[PDB]
Amino acid sequence: SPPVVDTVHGKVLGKFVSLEGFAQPVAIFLGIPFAKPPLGPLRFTPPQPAEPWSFVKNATSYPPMCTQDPKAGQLLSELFTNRKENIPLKLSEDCLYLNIYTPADLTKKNRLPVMVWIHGGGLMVGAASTYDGLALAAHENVVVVTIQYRLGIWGFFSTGDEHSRGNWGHLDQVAALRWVQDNIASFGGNPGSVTIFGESAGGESVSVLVLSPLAKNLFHRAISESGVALTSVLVKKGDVKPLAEQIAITAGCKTTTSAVMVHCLRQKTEEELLETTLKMKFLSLDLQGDPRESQPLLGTVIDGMLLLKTPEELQAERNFHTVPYMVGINKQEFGWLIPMLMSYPLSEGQLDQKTAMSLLWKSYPLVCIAKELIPEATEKYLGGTDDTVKKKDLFLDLIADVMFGVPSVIVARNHRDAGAPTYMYEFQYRPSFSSDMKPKTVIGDHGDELFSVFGAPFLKEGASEEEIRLSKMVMKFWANFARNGNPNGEGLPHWPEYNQKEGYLQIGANTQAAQKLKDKEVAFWTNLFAK
Amino acid sequence: SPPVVDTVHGKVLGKFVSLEGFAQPVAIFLGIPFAKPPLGPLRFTPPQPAEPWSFVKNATSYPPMCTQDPKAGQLLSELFTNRKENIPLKLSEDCLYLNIYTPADLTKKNRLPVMVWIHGGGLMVGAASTYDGLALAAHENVVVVTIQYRLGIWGFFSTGDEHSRGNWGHLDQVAALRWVQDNIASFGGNPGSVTIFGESAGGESVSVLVLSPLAKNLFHRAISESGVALTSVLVKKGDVKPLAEQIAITAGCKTTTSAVMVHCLRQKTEEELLETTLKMKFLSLDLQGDPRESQPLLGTVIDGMLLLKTPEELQAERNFHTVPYMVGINKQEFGWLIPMLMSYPLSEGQLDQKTAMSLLWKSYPLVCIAKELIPEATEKYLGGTDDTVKKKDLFLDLIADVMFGVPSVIVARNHRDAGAPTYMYEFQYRPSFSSDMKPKTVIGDHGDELFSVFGAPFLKEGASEEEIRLSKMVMKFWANFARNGNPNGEGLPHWPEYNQKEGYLQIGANTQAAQKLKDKEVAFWTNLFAK
Amino acid sequence: SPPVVDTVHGKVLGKFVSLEGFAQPVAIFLGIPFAKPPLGPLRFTPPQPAEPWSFVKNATSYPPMCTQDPKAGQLLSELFTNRKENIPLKLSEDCLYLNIYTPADLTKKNRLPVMVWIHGGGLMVGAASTYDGLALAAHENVVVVTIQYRLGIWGFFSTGDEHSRGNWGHLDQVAALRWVQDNIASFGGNPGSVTIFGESAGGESVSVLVLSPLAKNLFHRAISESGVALTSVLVKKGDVKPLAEQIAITAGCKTTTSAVMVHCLRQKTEEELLETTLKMKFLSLDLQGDPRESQPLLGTVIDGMLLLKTPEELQAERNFHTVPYMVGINKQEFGWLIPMLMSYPLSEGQLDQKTAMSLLWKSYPLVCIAKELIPEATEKYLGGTDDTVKKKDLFLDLIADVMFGVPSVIVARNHRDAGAPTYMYEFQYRPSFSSDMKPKTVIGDHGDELFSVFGAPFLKEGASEEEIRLSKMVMKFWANFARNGNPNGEGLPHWPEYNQKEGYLQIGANTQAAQKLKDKEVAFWTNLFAK
Numbered sequence A, B, C: 001s002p003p004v005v006d007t008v009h010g011k012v013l014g015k016f017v018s019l020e021g022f023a024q025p026v027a028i029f030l031g032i033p034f035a036k037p038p039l040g041p042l043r044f045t046p047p048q049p050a051e052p053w054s055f056v057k058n059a060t061s062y063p064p065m066c067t068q069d070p071k072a073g074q075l076l077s078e079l080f081t082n083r084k085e086n087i088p089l090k091l092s093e094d095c096l097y098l099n100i101y102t103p104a105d106l107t108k109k110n111r112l113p114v115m116v117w118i119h120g121g122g123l124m125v126g127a128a129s130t131y132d133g134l135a136l137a138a139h140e141n142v143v144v145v146t147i148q149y150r151l152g153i154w155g156f157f158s159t160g161d162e163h164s165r166g167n168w169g170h171l172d173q174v175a176a177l178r179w180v181q182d183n184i185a186s187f188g189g190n191p192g193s194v195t196i197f198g199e200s201a202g203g204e205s206v207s208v209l210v211l212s213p214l215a216k217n218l219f220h221r222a223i224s225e226s227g228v229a230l231t232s233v234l235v236k237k238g239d240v241k242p243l244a245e246q247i248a249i250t251a252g253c254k255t256t257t258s259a260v261m262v263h264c265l266r267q268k269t270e271e272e273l274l275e276t277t278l279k280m281k282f283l284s285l286d287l288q289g290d291p292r293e294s295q296p297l298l299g300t301v302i303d304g305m306l307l308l309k310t311p312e313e314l315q316a317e318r319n320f321h322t323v324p325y326m327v328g329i330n331k332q333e334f335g336w337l338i339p340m341l342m343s344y345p346l347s348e349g350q351l352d353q354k355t356a357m358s359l360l361w362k363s364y365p366l367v368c369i370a371k372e373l374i375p376e377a378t379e380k381y382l383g384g385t386d387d388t389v390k391k392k393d394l395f396l397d398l399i400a401d402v403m404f405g406v407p408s409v410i411v412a413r414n415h416r417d418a419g420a421p422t423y424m425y426e427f428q429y430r431p432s433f434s435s436d437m438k439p440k441t442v443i444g445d446h447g448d449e450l451f452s453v454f455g456a457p458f459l460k461e462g463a464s465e466e467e468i469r470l471s472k473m474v475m476k477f478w479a480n481f482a483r484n485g486n487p488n489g490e491g492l493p494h495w496p497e498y499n500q501k502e503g504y505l506q507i508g509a510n511t512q513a514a515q516k517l518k519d520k521e522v523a524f525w526t527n528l529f530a531k
């Protein structure tokens, strides 16, 4: 008989799924609501509790994914999914759901560690269902929870004031964690041992929650994979008023006052807000006009509720959750995936510095390098060789360092300096599950670690013995971290803590410890951005 | 001067109306709100208390009737009204009102028994104003209250889950009873002696309230006239999701999720939902396609709030309050009115068993008889004789027994076996107030008892002397039941209690007691349905 | 390869279909446009010539049926179709199409007689595709053409003046005939020998075309089956402005002037006008209010273009240039189908005269009998018997006589006295293809002859030798009439011409001539209506 669990708001019916090598079937629950559908007047407001239900709710079908560009969303899902076949998902404003994968025998009491995944997608696209927690849950005996949160306009529209503070998507993540605290024990999980992990915008979300007083007792370990609160493209600093007005005008709304704009946008249909999203061209590199006025994403803002100050200031006052924190990046963060998705204008293979400077200026929204500083930045990375082909690869390294590498090390250093256990890694491997459209030379591209973390080798076909072992090792490290706040364990390479010696783990075919990740880069950039 | 009464929410102004034969004029109050208008966000949600008003509210005009097919509603009103002239009513979603007829002298303190009427109409049409309480009030010295409740989509739309549980119309009936308990004393009524009564869908509603915990202390006597919770066509069993989706699609709504459907439907205009209602062609026998898929009514469901389980489960569970209960039926419940209203195919008047079986299959939504059982059921009723004209008559008896006769006796037996006082009657009389298009041979058609219960002979012109005595006797029985929970009285024929001897009263030109109502019919159907 | 024919407007591709027993394949062409789609400004205007197309138009799919109540239209199609399985059709205002079934060898020059079918449906519903001309075409070697024309509001809305004369549906029928004349030769048909035939409203349409100057020289023989221009329910006399205003108001249009109502109605969407149709409750006996205000149909009006005066006036004038005309009726025109479709109130069997008179008054829109004349009419038909069951049978005969019987004979007599060949028949047979809901005792019900005329026994299953022979005979009579304007032929029962002896053919299991059809009834009614 299928598994039936009693939650605070009512009973839920899931399904058993067996994985080769494990006797105990994994209980899976899909589409459990953790908040009230943010429809009508609830749009652009904090999430409210879900209404209780009578009888048994069927939790065996995948929930819709929050409204987003349908094509872009399906593409990212197909590129990141760890399951054999990508499942098509429907769009809906009614998307505050979470999926649960528990390997615990529900007929007995269990208090397994809980790993709550927050998906990436630039806060504009993505879905929880893209990630199958079956393999991780079974292999490491942890309860895996995938959550969804409002995206794009619905999750991050901000007027910069009290009429629409913003960060609705982050408040949804907090609401999901609150639900986990109040209900996860019913699924064999330990509410006292919750780890939050995410990649890209998901990693940024983890970083933000670490800095938020609203997430105080909702987690005990954090993992940010390729993305932190210092990844500037995802955090809006300064006056956010101009963007709110552009969105309102594009939707056909007056901009008389903030309250007027929000009231008008609240009357728009889902389709109308989706059409506004498309006209805005989010997540695409605008090669026209002043680079400084382009906004490829709607994201995190300093609202005063979730975040009281900028991430940089919160780090200085060392005011944030000092729980164990693992921060990592991939060898080639800007190697293919991101530039492909953003229609980046790079297609030759050989790049001259003159062209590089022009491209770097157009990339302002991604790297925010004043035009007066472009020459230095470019000469610094490309000036050491006239091999136009090598200049091109060094150019991609430059973007990667500014977006993920440097921000990640700075975040880790500040966390370490607050006295909290810290760990770092650099992932370098090319999964066989890579897209056929991606050249073989790209190793450790954005998102490549996902196939290891979610045990893709055990759900998809064609993985080599090497890739299989890499996944087993990565999952064991992550799960050891989830239960102990330290990834180390018997039979695993030693992973030094990120202390004053700045040790970190180089993960790949040949996994080994090293020290001083991106040291010279942090020095260079911190100095350049100070000018 | 006009009658002015103080209610919890404010003062109300009524009007005096005298009925010859009685010196004390009857105070009449029309359109008193008992809940907040279920508009906008309140559509598909439980009734909220009415807001208080200042000064004196003029209760001298008939309130609108809840949105419904206007042609069908006006036709039913003209066919069932007990007044000289049918009163044309306006349609509106703002329809949660009740009318009061009190014979008490408001200058003194009175605690007369209260009779609350719940009108019928398949939960799709109907109105309170159709029934004038003047005669009953004045003749039997009881306070008569006629209530309205949401109908059709507005009153019963259900997604099968927490986003729209359903039974909004029944919740309104409960709300009206709560209002009576809190305010009726001001109108000379005794909140400690409330009798709920109704016929057809109204009778089914009374039966439902008897089974609902939400109304446990809201009434002390109950009367179900031609309709109970076991009248299957009014109660939906199993998954109600398909019907919800069909309605949403017809209204031009997406069916992505339950929350999405309800939200879209809450956005539709009253006119848009009325057009959806008309396109669904409710309350009409569908002769095309599979009979098992037709839905003539939107009604009661097992929501978890009003009903925690099916009436059958509750009955066996003996989980219902034991108030005195009068349950009755008419000699020919399916004799003319219902078949006429539902457009039943019966032009020829004759009927061979082959045609009979086909019609019975098409009547699946009304009788729910599996196709493989049709021959047995048909042979049972028509196989006794030839003369296709007689067979068609037995065919109408078959439908009547399945929809009203058997369900009523079964409910009566269960109530009796719970230790509660129970009474039964079979009304067999043809009122002169019947439609002119109705054959003189139809006696005791559905609704025929209403003219006697509401004293039409004293409000309408041209009643026969025999009809006048019949009404006086019927009102006496009903009013006696209201005050003592026993219909018996001086000058009235003896009405036996429905005990193990199963005595009941045959009401008509000649009124006398009898025993074992529908005994054999119940045995036959219980067994046939047991297969 | 598939058959390809060259028409005035372009090439068309059909399909070859072979009927059992006939080696010459029938070339079938479905959905050939004979007019420009009556959309936008073309609504409520005369049909315009179809626009020519390049290359080859694929005419292999059934065209949509003109906008109409979809449930009513689907039901009728199922009840009248001669094919094995009913073909579900789409609704559309783009419906001016015709289907062609030609048994001619297109590789050779042929000039076969052409029979053009005009479907019935009260001018409110119906479709051409319901009728498969395969059997008729193959068995009698005639080209069968089934046409469509605008229905309901779209085909007959009239303001009574030049802003919307009306009869758009009849103008469509005329345009189809004009198309046949200009194109049929290419399909092996003789434009010099066209026979128009139709049943019910289609029969009335044929009758109207015989009386219209617009249709002269467009056909050479006519057949009206159960319907003529004197069937008053289909012809509106007097002022039609009141009905136009009711339709405009229901549709939410102002009634300031005729030009304004029409302009507004033309701006409504197809769905809005269909909703108006549903709200109007057409084709249903209105049991409410004054029966003289009822309007169950939107039909023929005296526009001044199609009809210059009432059919009654045109008959005397002997203006209608002559052509051979066959006029027929069925034994029980009001036996089951029509009463069933119109929701006629006849649940019970037997009927008393008092009730009969009330029903006859409510039937005013169908029979047009002044209230002071109801007693006489009723006594004439029912006053000769006490058995109320028979009074019910006789009552149905009365309605049938006033609607079809008398009007048909009067038309035949007038045609005869105009000098043209005239023939009459009375069909008395119960098709095995009848609906299972129709009592076995109904014989010669409205539409019963259709199955014989269209060779249902050769397409559907179950037909007995007797039913098969009847169809062969009927198709033979019909085709001979189309060939020679005289149905008689070798091996067929003698069919006398309808002359001063008023001979007519009684068609059924036993077919033979007789004389003076409805003679006594015509005298009675002519005298009664003269009062």
Ligand SMILES: CC(C)(COP(=O)(O)OP(=O)(O)OC[C@H]1O[C@@H](n2cnc3c(N)ncnc32)[C@H](O)[C@@H]1OP(=O)(O)O)[C@H](O)C(=O)NCCC(=O)NCCS
Residues within 6 Å of the ligand: A068, A069, A070, A071, A072, A073, A075, A076, A077, A120, A121, A122, A124, A125, A126, A200, A201, A233, A278, A280, A281, A282, A283, A284, A338, A340, A341, A342
């Ligand atoms: C491309 C992506 C960024 C989505 O973008 P988006 O929400 O659709 O917004 P965009 O402005 O980029 O729209 C681009 C348009 O280009 C066109 N296009 C063509 N080929 C395309 C491709 N391969 N990828 C994306 N867009 C494409 C489409 O017409 C699309 O228009 P649409 O709105 O009608 O679907 C990507 O699919 C995303 O899902 N991946 C995750 C990115 C995340 O990791 N970044 C974090 C910080 S960099």
Ligand SMILES: CC(C)(COP(=O)(O)OP(=O)(O)OC[C@H]1O[C@@H](n2cnc3c(N)ncnc32)[C@H](O)[C@@H]1OP(=O)(O)O)[C@H](O)C(=O)NCCC(=O)NCCS
Residues within 6 Å of the ligand: B069, B070, B071, B072, B073, B075, B076, B120, B121, B122, B123, B124, B125, B126, B200, B201, B233, B278, B280, B281, B282, B283, B284, B338, B340, B341, B342, C278, C279, C280, C281, C282, C284, C285, C286, C287, C342, C343
């Ligand atoms: C017929 C009745 C069921 C109302 O139905 P409804 O809400 O209009 O829905 P329907 O699908 O039946 O509509 C039928 C259509 O048929 C046509 N019609 C023809 N003759 C009719 C008739 N005698 N009565 C009703 N409708 C008729 C109308 O055009 C109507 O169209 P509309 O929707 O534009 O008004 C009835 O009038 C009702 O008011 N009486 C009480 C029934 C109750 O006792 N039954 C409880 C369970 S058996």
Ligand SMILES: CC(C)(COP(=O)(O)OP(=O)(O)OC[C@H]1O[C@@H](n2cnc3c(N)ncnc32)[C@H](O)[C@@H]1OP(=O)(O)O)[C@H](O)C(=O)NCCC(=O)NCCS
Residues within 6 Å of the ligand: B278, B279, B280, B281, B282, B284, B285, B286, B287, B342, B343, B344, B345, C069, C070, C071, C072, C073, C075, C076, C077, C120, C121, C122, C124, C125, C126, C200, C201, C233, C278, C280, C281, C282, C283, C284, C338, C340, C341, C342, C343
């Ligand atoms: C019934 C018929 C007249 C169609 O009517 P209509 O265009 O739907 O308009 P109506 O007012 O009759 O609608 C009646 C309603 O009653 C209900 N109904 C129930 N049983 C029914 C039945 N057996 N037949 C017809 N309607 C029925 C339906 O809910 C229908 O609802 P809808 O309007 O939303 O579809 C018939 O189907 C027609 O197609 N046949 C041709 C009749 C023609 O030969 N007669 C000419 C002389 S009058």
Ligand SMILES: CC(=O)N[C@H]1[C@H]([C@H](O)[C@H](O)CO)O[C@@](O)(C(=O)O)C[C@@H]1O
Residues within 6 Å of the ligand: C030, C031, C032, C033, C057, C058, C059, C060, C061, C062, C063, C064
């Ligand atoms: C599909 C479509 O648009 N419907 C049309 C079809 C298509 O030609 C065929 O289906 C091939 O696509 O047939 C017609 O063109 C035709 O018979 O003349 C009319 C019809 O409206």
Ligand SMILES: *[C@@H]1O[C@H](CO)[C@@H](O)[C@H](O)[C@H]1NC(C)=O
Residues within 6 Å of the ligand: A058, A059, A060, A061
């Ligand atoms: C639960 O939902 C699934 C997916 O729609 C369905 O297949 C299954 O039958 C449902 N179980 C029940 C009966 O609730």
Ligand SMILES: *[C@@H]1O[C@H](CO)[C@@H](O)[C@H](O)[C@H]1NC(C)=O
Residues within 6 Å of the ligand: C013, C058, C060, C061
């Ligand atoms: C013609 O239309 C039919 C529609 O069923 C289609 O199957 C066919 O491919 C089309 N082309 C031709 C002319 O064969």
Ligand SMILES: *[C@H]1O[C@H](CO)[C@@H](O)[C@H](O)[C@H]1NC(C)=O
Residues within 6 Å of the ligand: B058, B060, B061
């Ligand atoms: C309230 O309205 C009624 C209805 O017209 C009217 O008769 C009455 O006088 C009004 N109230 C007063 C007394 O002003």
